[PDB]
RNA sequence: GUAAGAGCCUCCUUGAUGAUGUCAUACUUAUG
RNA sequence: GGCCUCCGAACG
RNA sequence: GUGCUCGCUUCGGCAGCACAUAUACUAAACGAUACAGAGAAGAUUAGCAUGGCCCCUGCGCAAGGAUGACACGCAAAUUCGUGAAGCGU
């Protein structure tokens, strides 16, 4: 160590800047869907009364109006959606429609007029949108959102209808029955719960550790049974509820579930049920025989879902996938 | 290490700071070396 | 044979070749070999153990006994050394560019400075040695089945 | 027992008053208590400090304050990626890194601060880092500390207090000071920006002289490929290297342009005419 | 064995040598040495295996099997001297 | 600010510290908040030292400034220090300190009635308790190191936090038998491993169950 | 969700998870061998459905 | 009757049915 | 002729 | 810069002594909530134990948080009999 007094002079020179160093039906593909979209199909809709007009919803956030059945070409284009449509809906007559947009914006759409209806919003991103059965007025629509409460919404009155929480899980989809006193509610909690709806109180809840999510939910046209395909690729047919049991049809396996919700299809001859597969193959099932039909691969991409013709006799079944849709005879 | 010294506790207080060497009356090491 | 020194190698290993298997000759009588070094070795070793145990016992016993140590220290610590032998362009100073190095201000009434209290127990491995054992005979059918 | 304290953060003043700190803030990398030394290189410049611990400074082998690349005085990232590949595990779980660092330093018996220097044999990256480094880049490396109060006119003290007026810069591109301070080893950074900026049949070579012979140029250029011939002109102190294939002529061409040091003497090499003149 | 199934096998052979420098156990050293020598490095593997087996303790089935494999490999000339050294290390009627 | 800093360090808001030396559960927190509140030992000790401290503090403050006291200041000083100083807010954390010291305060009452007895007396007749204030001051002279390392190690452990496993075994009671059985099964595993020269590895682990339980039912039964 | 710890191993994102130490054969750095082991390593893992 | 936890402030597979309601008995409720 | 142990707070 | 000394020649001009390198660590998990409620072979629960990549209360190597909570069975490798087909110098 050096001297501290010398370090003081060295610091003083440093401040001075001194540098000195000194017998089953076999349907086949009929025709491709009208037009199409690059983005995956968001929802598959169709005209309930006519059946010829199909409304294709895609992830492109543009509602695609399609004319389909016969002389095959689409309908027109529909815009105005803020973000990708989470769900699609339509009125009983078909001239009016409802839209559920992942922007958390529910926008009704007029179709036959060439343009939509109006733009609306909700509290959270709606996970389900469905029209109200029974009374032909239906000022409210049965819907559901990430808030985990099935809520009907009155529209033409300027404000919604009511909100009711059946379960703590986010409602995946809601399909109201014909009795109008109960509406089947499937939620992300995996618990299938019917809900008394018009009354603020629900109905009942069942099967929380079963029926994984809600990949497919459907009911027979006769209303005797409602089957729901589950994300284990396990189709659980539930005998519909009026009873002490009030559930449980049968068990139908053989499908494929990749986790994406697939639109369930059937042939309502009292015969068949057909739905898409998670791998993209076309799932054909014989139903009333308690066993399926056959698995015929159709779409090259992940199958979004499928639809069926009206109920008269065997006719044809439409199909759709991600990025493209194909109808089968 | 240079760490892990923060707070003390009981029973760790200074104790027996002065040891006790063997007295010539009790045990002597040289007497034990020369012991009979 | 030098491959056994891979990893950390400093002083004490004393297993490479197998020549240490059988001992060397037999027990013999020799003053340096069979007894010990002189008394000055135990005296200097005991004094060194008193210095090391005095420093370690002083730091550990001083920290474990909050007598508040001392005031601070007197390390004026005038440091004349090459700045990492840089040899940079031109000159950053005069000669080795010495600097003044003193102690640090004492600790205030607040004990906390940096609190860790985390958990990282063990986690280093240890270098494996050779077996260094005479292989025995197996138990065959009878002794193993017994 | 001083810190790293390289020549960049030392300053131009031969004498410097430094104040050590026994227990400082925890290291940003090693996350352990260490010593924090403070010094002011400039007259009116703010006092410096070292946020890297002894294990943090020994792991990256960098200055405790400037944290440049090794002793070469370059940016850490670029020169580290140029050394071999990476050879580090800063990522996650410092508890697992405390075992590799504790066993690292505890198992390493050869180290030091400055009783040593150089003692290497050339290097692969010494030319790129040497061309990528400047002479004492001490400009605006300490004092300015941009302040928003003087920019809005709300500062009462003004220039009397630190953080002198007109310090800030356009908030568009990296700030060259705190931008590299946001991350540590993660970002590509002006290390990589100035690294890419630093990266950018006959061959004539001048500046040979009596120290350089024809065998040295034939052996140096022969590693690229087969050479057709060599013309050694001692009067002009130049040599023409003719190769059979223009591939090695292009390799040794571009790599031989102001990169050629033969026997410690730089050589200026220009591409051959080949215009039939 | 897990590293030996890899396509590299260089770090698996070097790891086998690291196990040789580790505890030989007179089981995995002779067995693993026979596996490496059977994999490749005939002259080299038999050389390091003969130096290791000739370093710490003699053997019986491993020494006789090593001299048999080294004899059937190419020539029995070196295996004769190695058999005389191994037999001289532990003489017996067998 | 000391108690407000104690409750300020670890966010609680389950009670409020009152300069009366009274912390009350305003929001009335219970369950996990009840288990997380506590502060009934060291914080109650500092509430006692600050209870008598701030007590006599505000007492002399009211004496000097505001309401005139004088003879009433010495009155409430000796009296209130004796009876009130004997009760006050100390209680729990004192224990033998305010027990034997409280008996010393009773002796200070015997000195009170002793000194002034015959001619007259009714209320706080003075007889200043500053001697007993030196008694309790000696209780704070002995306890001040105890509460000094108490608040030092407690406050130091507050910002630091609970360390890793600190051993601290052999709690006696019925736990000494469990350590004797575990340690009994410990050396039995080493000697059991040393019983067979080769044998097997995993086969020795299952023997601890057969020998263990076999000895249990063996000695415990006939 | 919150990145500190989780329902899995702490900090674990299985790239260089847990200390891997290192290995050297004899007094040398093997380069092309490790590159071939990494090439075959990438050849073992393939994208598909199973 | 209640300690704890969670998040929102570019190519495939082995074919067993269903809807009309009431008693002894078993299990789950802080409504006695 | 006298003698007067007593002395509570949490947690659980 | 002040104070002092005519120290040198003007009241102020010049000279000498004494006071002599601050600041920086300067300035700019726990709240709230739905849910459901708790191990030891048929129903209920005493408790104390063992290792952490889990902690709080508690000055504390006292102790306390439903037994404070977390916590299931994979083995380093074979050997002999019967029948059928193909090939064989």
mmCIF file with all atom_site columns, N, CA and C in Angstrom, chain A residues 287-327:
data_model
loop_
_atom_site.group_PDB
_atom_site.id
_atom_site.type_symbol
_atom_site.label_atom_id
_atom_site.label_alt_id
_atom_site.label_comp_id
_atom_site.label_asym_id
_atom_site.label_entity_id
_atom_site.label_seq_id
_atom_site.pdbx_PDB_ins_code
_atom_site.Cartn_x
_atom_site.Cartn_y
_atom_site.Cartn_z
_atom_site.occupancy
_atom_site.B_iso_or_equiv
_atom_site.pdbx_formal_charge
_atom_site.auth_seq_id
_atom_site.auth_comp_id
_atom_site.auth_asym_id
_atom_site.auth_atom_id
_atom_site.pdbx_PDB_model_num
ATOM 1   N N  . UNK A 1 287 ? -77.444 -47.616 -36.164 1.00 0.00 ? 287 UNK A N  1
ATOM 2   C CA . UNK A 1 287 ? -77.849 -47.244 -34.814 1.00 0.00 ? 287 UNK A CA 1
ATOM 3   C C  . UNK A 1 287 ? -78.855 -48.218 -34.214 1.00 0.00 ? 287 UNK A C  1
ATOM 4   N N  . UNK A 1 288 ? -80.040 -48.347 -34.820 1.00 0.00 ? 288 UNK A N  1
ATOM 5   C CA . UNK A 1 288 ? -81.106 -49.157 -34.235 1.00 0.00 ? 288 UNK A CA 1
ATOM 6   C C  . UNK A 1 288 ? -80.711 -50.617 -34.057 1.00 0.00 ? 288 UNK A C  1
ATOM 7   N N  . UNK A 1 289 ? -79.633 -51.058 -34.699 1.00 0.00 ? 289 UNK A N  1
ATOM 8   C CA . UNK A 1 289 ? -79.089 -52.392 -34.491 1.00 0.00 ? 289 UNK A CA 1
ATOM 9   C C  . UNK A 1 289 ? -78.135 -52.455 -33.307 1.00 0.00 ? 289 UNK A C  1
ATOM 10  N N  . UNK A 1 290 ? -77.971 -51.345 -32.577 1.00 0.00 ? 290 UNK A N  1
ATOM 11  C CA . UNK A 1 290 ? -77.073 -51.213 -31.431 1.00 0.00 ? 290 UNK A CA 1
ATOM 12  C C  . UNK A 1 290 ? -75.612 -51.264 -31.859 1.00 0.00 ? 290 UNK A C  1
ATOM 13  N N  . UNK A 1 291 ? -75.370 -51.516 -33.142 1.00 0.00 ? 291 UNK A N  1
ATOM 14  C CA . UNK A 1 291 ? -74.038 -51.479 -33.719 1.00 0.00 ? 291 UNK A CA 1
ATOM 15  C C  . UNK A 1 291 ? -74.070 -50.606 -34.964 1.00 0.00 ? 291 UNK A C  1
ATOM 16  N N  . UNK A 1 292 ? -72.899 -50.078 -35.314 1.00 0.00 ? 292 UNK A N  1
ATOM 17  C CA . UNK A 1 292 ? -72.676 -49.026 -36.303 1.00 0.00 ? 292 UNK A CA 1
ATOM 18  C C  . UNK A 1 292 ? -72.802 -49.554 -37.727 1.00 0.00 ? 292 UNK A C  1
ATOM 19  N N  . UNK A 1 293 ? -72.273 -48.830 -38.712 1.00 0.00 ? 293 UNK A N  1
ATOM 20  C CA . UNK A 1 293 ? -72.332 -49.314 -40.087 1.00 0.00 ? 293 UNK A CA 1
ATOM 21  C C  . UNK A 1 293 ? -70.943 -49.570 -40.660 1.00 0.00 ? 293 UNK A C  1
ATOM 22  N N  . UNK A 1 294 ? -70.239 -48.511 -41.056 1.00 0.00 ? 294 UNK A N  1
ATOM 23  C CA . UNK A 1 294 ? -68.900 -48.658 -41.609 1.00 0.00 ? 294 UNK A CA 1
ATOM 24  C C  . UNK A 1 294 ? -68.170 -47.327 -41.509 1.00 0.00 ? 294 UNK A C  1
ATOM 25  N N  . UNK A 1 295 ? -66.842 -47.399 -41.545 1.00 0.00 ? 295 UNK A N  1
ATOM 26  C CA . UNK A 1 295 ? -65.982 -46.222 -41.480 1.00 0.00 ? 295 UNK A CA 1
ATOM 27  C C  . UNK A 1 295 ? -65.369 -46.004 -42.858 1.00 0.00 ? 295 UNK A C  1
ATOM 28  N N  . UNK A 1 296 ? -65.783 -44.932 -43.530 1.00 0.00 ? 296 UNK A N  1
ATOM 29  C CA . UNK A 1 296 ? -65.309 -44.606 -44.871 1.00 0.00 ? 296 UNK A CA 1
ATOM 30  C C  . UNK A 1 296 ? -64.651 -43.233 -44.832 1.00 0.00 ? 296 UNK A C  1
ATOM 31  N N  . UNK A 1 297 ? -63.338 -43.199 -45.050 1.00 0.00 ? 297 UNK A N  1
ATOM 32  C CA . UNK A 1 297 ? -62.609 -41.938 -45.039 1.00 0.00 ? 297 UNK A CA 1
ATOM 33  C C  . UNK A 1 297 ? -63.004 -41.090 -46.242 1.00 0.00 ? 297 UNK A C  1
ATOM 34  N N  . UNK A 1 298 ? -63.325 -39.820 -45.988 1.00 0.00 ? 298 UNK A N  1
ATOM 35  C CA . UNK A 1 298 ? -63.757 -38.908 -47.046 1.00 0.00 ? 298 UNK A CA 1
ATOM 36  C C  . UNK A 1 298 ? -62.882 -37.663 -47.090 1.00 0.00 ? 298 UNK A C  1
ATOM 37  N N  . UNK A 1 299 ? -62.954 -36.795 -46.084 1.00 0.00 ? 299 UNK A N  1
ATOM 38  C CA . UNK A 1 299 ? -62.184 -35.559 -46.106 1.00 0.00 ? 299 UNK A CA 1
ATOM 39  C C  . UNK A 1 299 ? -60.713 -35.832 -45.821 1.00 0.00 ? 299 UNK A C  1
ATOM 40  N N  . UNK A 1 300 ? -59.841 -35.079 -46.493 1.00 0.00 ? 300 UNK A N  1
ATOM 41  C CA . UNK A 1 300 ? -58.404 -35.206 -46.292 1.00 0.00 ? 300 UNK A CA 1
ATOM 42  C C  . UNK A 1 300 ? -57.906 -34.446 -45.070 1.00 0.00 ? 300 UNK A C  1
ATOM 43  N N  . UNK A 1 301 ? -58.712 -33.549 -44.514 1.00 0.00 ? 301 UNK A N  1
ATOM 44  C CA . UNK A 1 301 ? -58.363 -32.780 -43.330 1.00 0.00 ? 301 UNK A CA 1
ATOM 45  C C  . UNK A 1 301 ? -59.264 -33.192 -42.169 1.00 0.00 ? 301 UNK A C  1
ATOM 46  N N  . UNK A 1 302 ? -59.080 -32.521 -41.030 1.00 0.00 ? 302 UNK A N  1
ATOM 47  C CA . UNK A 1 302 ? -59.868 -32.835 -39.843 1.00 0.00 ? 302 UNK A CA 1
ATOM 48  C C  . UNK A 1 302 ? -61.337 -32.551 -40.118 1.00 0.00 ? 302 UNK A C  1
ATOM 49  N N  . UNK A 1 303 ? -62.184 -33.543 -39.856 1.00 0.00 ? 303 UNK A N  1
ATOM 50  C CA . UNK A 1 303 ? -63.609 -33.416 -40.138 1.00 0.00 ? 303 UNK A CA 1
ATOM 51  C C  . UNK A 1 303 ? -64.260 -32.478 -39.129 1.00 0.00 ? 303 UNK A C  1
ATOM 52  N N  . UNK A 1 304 ? -64.919 -31.433 -39.633 1.00 0.00 ? 304 UNK A N  1
ATOM 53  C CA . UNK A 1 304 ? -65.606 -30.490 -38.760 1.00 0.00 ? 304 UNK A CA 1
ATOM 54  C C  . UNK A 1 304 ? -66.954 -31.043 -38.321 1.00 0.00 ? 304 UNK A C  1
ATOM 55  N N  . UNK A 1 305 ? -67.683 -31.676 -39.233 1.00 0.00 ? 305 UNK A N  1
ATOM 56  C CA . UNK A 1 305 ? -68.972 -32.233 -38.883 1.00 0.00 ? 305 UNK A CA 1
ATOM 57  C C  . UNK A 1 305 ? -69.700 -32.734 -40.113 1.00 0.00 ? 305 UNK A C  1
ATOM 58  N N  . UNK A 1 306 ? -71.001 -32.959 -39.936 1.00 0.00 ? 306 UNK A N  1
ATOM 59  C CA . UNK A 1 306 ? -71.844 -33.457 -41.012 1.00 0.00 ? 306 UNK A CA 1
ATOM 60  C C  . UNK A 1 306 ? -73.288 -33.055 -40.749 1.00 0.00 ? 306 UNK A C  1
ATOM 61  N N  . UNK A 1 307 ? -74.093 -33.102 -41.810 1.00 0.00 ? 307 UNK A N  1
ATOM 62  C CA . UNK A 1 307 ? -75.509 -32.761 -41.761 1.00 0.00 ? 307 UNK A CA 1
ATOM 63  C C  . UNK A 1 307 ? -76.281 -33.803 -42.561 1.00 0.00 ? 307 UNK A C  1
ATOM 64  N N  . UNK A 1 308 ? -77.604 -33.774 -42.414 1.00 0.00 ? 308 UNK A N  1
ATOM 65  C CA . UNK A 1 308 ? -78.476 -34.731 -43.076 1.00 0.00 ? 308 UNK A CA 1
ATOM 66  C C  . UNK A 1 308 ? -79.596 -34.003 -43.807 1.00 0.00 ? 308 UNK A C  1
ATOM 67  N N  . UNK A 1 309 ? -80.239 -34.730 -44.716 1.00 0.00 ? 309 UNK A N  1
ATOM 68  C CA . UNK A 1 309 ? -81.385 -34.242 -45.472 1.00 0.00 ? 309 UNK A CA 1
ATOM 69  C C  . UNK A 1 309 ? -82.609 -34.192 -44.561 1.00 0.00 ? 309 UNK A C  1
ATOM 70  N N  . UNK A 1 310 ? -83.774 -33.703 -45.031 1.00 0.00 ? 310 UNK A N  1
ATOM 71  C CA . UNK A 1 310 ? -84.985 -33.811 -44.203 1.00 0.00 ? 310 UNK A CA 1
ATOM 72  C C  . UNK A 1 310 ? -85.421 -35.256 -44.025 1.00 0.00 ? 310 UNK A C  1
ATOM 73  N N  . UNK A 1 311 ? -86.492 -35.488 -43.270 1.00 0.00 ? 311 UNK A N  1
ATOM 74  C CA . UNK A 1 311 ? -86.936 -36.847 -42.972 1.00 0.00 ? 311 UNK A CA 1
ATOM 75  C C  . UNK A 1 311 ? -88.127 -37.176 -43.863 1.00 0.00 ? 311 UNK A C  1
ATOM 76  N N  . UNK A 1 312 ? -87.873 -37.984 -44.890 1.00 0.00 ? 312 UNK A N  1
ATOM 77  C CA . UNK A 1 312 ? -88.903 -38.639 -45.682 1.00 0.00 ? 312 UNK A CA 1
ATOM 78  C C  . UNK A 1 312 ? -88.497 -40.092 -45.872 1.00 0.00 ? 312 UNK A C  1
ATOM 79  N N  . UNK A 1 313 ? -87.408 -40.289 -46.610 1.00 0.00 ? 313 UNK A N  1
ATOM 80  C CA . UNK A 1 313 ? -86.759 -41.580 -46.779 1.00 0.00 ? 313 UNK A CA 1
ATOM 81  C C  . UNK A 1 313 ? -85.260 -41.323 -46.911 1.00 0.00 ? 313 UNK A C  1
ATOM 82  N N  . UNK A 1 314 ? -84.510 -42.361 -47.272 1.00 0.00 ? 314 UNK A N  1
ATOM 83  C CA . UNK A 1 314 ? -83.076 -42.200 -47.475 1.00 0.00 ? 314 UNK A CA 1
ATOM 84  C C  . UNK A 1 314 ? -82.817 -41.283 -48.665 1.00 0.00 ? 314 UNK A C  1
ATOM 85  N N  . UNK A 1 315 ? -82.033 -40.228 -48.440 1.00 0.00 ? 315 UNK A N  1
ATOM 86  C CA . UNK A 1 315 ? -81.767 -39.251 -49.489 1.00 0.00 ? 315 UNK A CA 1
ATOM 87  C C  . UNK A 1 315 ? -80.274 -39.000 -49.659 1.00 0.00 ? 315 UNK A C  1
ATOM 88  N N  . UNK A 1 316 ? -79.657 -38.343 -48.676 1.00 0.00 ? 316 UNK A N  1
ATOM 89  C CA . UNK A 1 316 ? -78.255 -37.938 -48.751 1.00 0.00 ? 316 UNK A CA 1
ATOM 90  C C  . UNK A 1 316 ? -77.847 -37.290 -47.435 1.00 0.00 ? 316 UNK A C  1
ATOM 91  N N  . UNK A 1 317 ? -76.539 -37.181 -47.203 1.00 0.00 ? 317 UNK A N  1
ATOM 92  C CA . UNK A 1 317 ? -76.005 -36.570 -45.989 1.00 0.00 ? 317 UNK A CA 1
ATOM 93  C C  . UNK A 1 317 ? -74.841 -35.669 -46.375 1.00 0.00 ? 317 UNK A C  1
ATOM 94  N N  . UNK A 1 318 ? -74.957 -34.379 -46.069 1.00 0.00 ? 318 UNK A N  1
ATOM 95  C CA . UNK A 1 318 ? -73.866 -33.448 -46.305 1.00 0.00 ? 318 UNK A CA 1
ATOM 96  C C  . UNK A 1 318 ? -72.754 -33.657 -45.279 1.00 0.00 ? 318 UNK A C  1
ATOM 97  N N  . UNK A 1 319 ? -71.561 -33.175 -45.621 1.00 0.00 ? 319 UNK A N  1
ATOM 98  C CA . UNK A 1 319 ? -70.405 -33.292 -44.745 1.00 0.00 ? 319 UNK A CA 1
ATOM 99  C C  . UNK A 1 319 ? -69.550 -32.037 -44.858 1.00 0.00 ? 319 UNK A C  1
ATOM 100 N N  . UNK A 1 320 ? -68.743 -31.804 -43.833 1.00 0.00 ? 320 UNK A N  1
ATOM 101 C CA . UNK A 1 320 ? -67.844 -30.662 -43.831 1.00 0.00 ? 320 UNK A CA 1
ATOM 102 C C  . UNK A 1 320 ? -66.641 -30.914 -42.954 1.00 0.00 ? 320 UNK A C  1
ATOM 103 N N  . UNK A 1 321 ? -65.547 -30.227 -43.277 1.00 0.00 ? 321 UNK A N  1
ATOM 104 C CA . UNK A 1 321 ? -64.276 -30.400 -42.590 1.00 0.00 ? 321 UNK A CA 1
ATOM 105 C C  . UNK A 1 321 ? -63.629 -29.028 -42.431 1.00 0.00 ? 321 UNK A C  1
ATOM 106 N N  . UNK A 1 322 ? -62.391 -29.017 -41.945 1.00 0.00 ? 322 UNK A N  1
ATOM 107 C CA . UNK A 1 322 ? -61.650 -27.773 -41.777 1.00 0.00 ? 322 UNK A CA 1
ATOM 108 C C  . UNK A 1 322 ? -61.054 -27.357 -43.117 1.00 0.00 ? 322 UNK A C  1
ATOM 109 N N  . UNK A 1 323 ? -61.436 -26.173 -43.594 1.00 0.00 ? 323 UNK A N  1
ATOM 110 C CA . UNK A 1 323 ? -60.952 -25.652 -44.850 1.00 0.00 ? 323 UNK A CA 1
ATOM 111 C C  . UNK A 1 323 ? -61.775 -26.035 -46.063 1.00 0.00 ? 323 UNK A C  1
ATOM 112 N N  . UNK A 1 324 ? -62.571 -27.098 -45.977 1.00 0.00 ? 324 UNK A N  1
ATOM 113 C CA . UNK A 1 324 ? -63.386 -27.537 -47.100 1.00 0.00 ? 324 UNK A CA 1
ATOM 114 C C  . UNK A 1 324 ? -64.560 -28.345 -46.569 1.00 0.00 ? 324 UNK A C  1
ATOM 115 N N  . UNK A 1 325 ? -65.585 -28.479 -47.409 1.00 0.00 ? 325 UNK A N  1
ATOM 116 C CA . UNK A 1 325 ? -66.788 -29.229 -47.070 1.00 0.00 ? 325 UNK A CA 1
ATOM 117 C C  . UNK A 1 325 ? -67.202 -30.050 -48.282 1.00 0.00 ? 325 UNK A C  1
ATOM 118 N N  . UNK A 1 326 ? -67.697 -31.262 -48.031 1.00 0.00 ? 326 UNK A N  1
ATOM 119 C CA . UNK A 1 326 ? -68.091 -32.169 -49.101 1.00 0.00 ? 326 UNK A CA 1
ATOM 120 C C  . UNK A 1 326 ? -69.392 -32.863 -48.729 1.00 0.00 ? 326 UNK A C  1
ATOM 121 N N  . UNK A 1 327 ? -70.368 -32.807 -49.630 1.00 0.00 ? 327 UNK A N  1
ATOM 122 C CA . UNK A 1 327 ? -71.656 -33.451 -49.417 1.00 0.00 ? 327 UNK A CA 1
ATOM 123 C C  . UNK A 1 327 ? -71.658 -34.839 -50.046 1.00 0.00 ? 327 UNK A C  1
#
